[PDB]
Amino acid sequence: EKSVVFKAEGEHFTDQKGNTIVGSGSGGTTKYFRIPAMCTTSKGTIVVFADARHNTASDQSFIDTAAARSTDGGKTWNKKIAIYNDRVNSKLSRVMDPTCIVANIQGRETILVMVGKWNNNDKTWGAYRDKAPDTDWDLVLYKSTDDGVTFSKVETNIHDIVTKNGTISAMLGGVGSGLQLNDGKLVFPVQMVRTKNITTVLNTSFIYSTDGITWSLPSGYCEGFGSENNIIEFNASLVNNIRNSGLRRSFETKDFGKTWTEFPPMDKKVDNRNHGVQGSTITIPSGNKLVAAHSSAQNKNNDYTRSDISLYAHNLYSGEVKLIDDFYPKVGNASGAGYSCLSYRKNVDKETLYVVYEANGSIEFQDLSRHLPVIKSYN
Ligand SMILES: [K+]
Structure with missing residues (x-):
């Protein structure tokens, strides 16, 4: 049923010159994996x-x-490093927290992956609010146009638009997957740490682009909560689905990011209990209707173990919610647990629904396609 994508203490990577990366797992393996993001192509490539x-x-x-x-x-699985940290600080240099998009960018099928980058900061990103933006921070974007075989850096204006805004200390993608809108626009959900003078520490929003090179921020902000989030497109709205301690939150924007209001079909529908957890939210067509599929943890121990990573369906019309599958029905490793990413496509007549998730330091995969008839009914 499950394949292992990345095995904790079981992988050996090489650096840019081809020398092994000696980690702290047994045998000099990489110790631990976190924060999965999955994108599936028109070729079926995962x-x-x-x-x-x-x-x-x-x-x-x-x-x-x-x-x-x-x-x-x-x-x-064939494994490699897609993005190397800058190798400034052997303890702290990092590229982290991926969000991916698969899109047709002016005809060219592309996988985008966006990650935050730090070097010398010894604390989490909320500790650095004095500068607009933090000098140790960056947000980097890589692309593949060869079906995921090779990735190259994309030169963007993302750092520039954050500096111009002047009230953002650091920004990340929302974690998991972003989207391409029906009209072609590329959209990454984002999370941001605001400068100190802003009363709200965290906000959610998005960045958008036509070509993947020049990006824009909308003028408005959504309340941050636990800030990790995903966006879906539903009629003339963008709708988010945000981590929060306890009940997850969901807001909609009808003006392309100027203002946000609660979205009743998803707001407060799934409980992740203490601390909250990242979750993945996507749409699946059913005739000319849509259903949202969502994954996050039931968290039966009400703590950082984030047990029982589960797939839900949200009826976007009626607001009903139901548990489809508790696909990881296990207590996680409190050192870092619970995260997931869904991926749906219809390639020709073949529909696939896949998930990846955190499993005791490893990343596991499941093919959840057998659940599609149940999800698609929920409209
Ligand atoms: K964190």
Whole structure:
């Protein structure tokens, strides 16, 4: 049922010159993996990104962005580093927290992956609010136009638009996957730490682009909560689905990011209990209707173990919610647990629904396609 994408203490990567990366797992393996992101192409190719936390599960550690590629439906995986940290600080240099998009960008099928980058900061990003933006921070974007075989840096204006805004200390993608709108626009959900003088520490929003090079921020902000979030497109709205301690939150914007209001079909529908957790939210067509599929943890121990990572369906018309599958019905590792990413496509007449998720320091994959008739009914 499950394949292992990245095995904790079981992978060996090489650096840009071809020398092994000696981590702290047994045998000099990478110690721990976190924060999976999955994007599936029109060829059926699955690409899974994750933090390769070579030494420890801590966010403040030495991390590269690994990529695993499967062309056999998730049975086997070719693994490499997609994004290397800057190798300034052997304890702290890091590229982390991926969000991916698969899109047709002016005709060219592209996988985008966006990650935050730090070097010398020894604390989490909320501790750095004095500058607009933090000098240790960056937000980097890589692309593949060869079906996930090679990734190259994209030169963007993302750092510039954050500086121009003047009230953002640091920004990340929302974690998991972004989207391409029906009209072609590329949209990354984002999370941001505001400068100190702003009363709200965290906000959610999005960045958008036509070409993947020049990006824009909307003028408005959504309340931050636990800030990790995903966006779906539903009629003339963009709708988010945000981490929060307890009940997850969901807002809609009808003016392309100027204002946000609660979205009743998803707001407060799933309980992740203490601390909250990242969750993945996507749409699945059913005739000319849509259903939202969502994954996050039931968290039966009400703590950082984030047990029982589960798939839900949200009826976007009636607001009903139901549990479809508790696909990881296990207590997680409190060093870092609970995260997931869904991926749906219809390629020709073949519909696929896949998930990746955190499993005791490893990243696992499941093919959840057998659940599609149940999800699609929920309209
Ligand atoms: K964190």
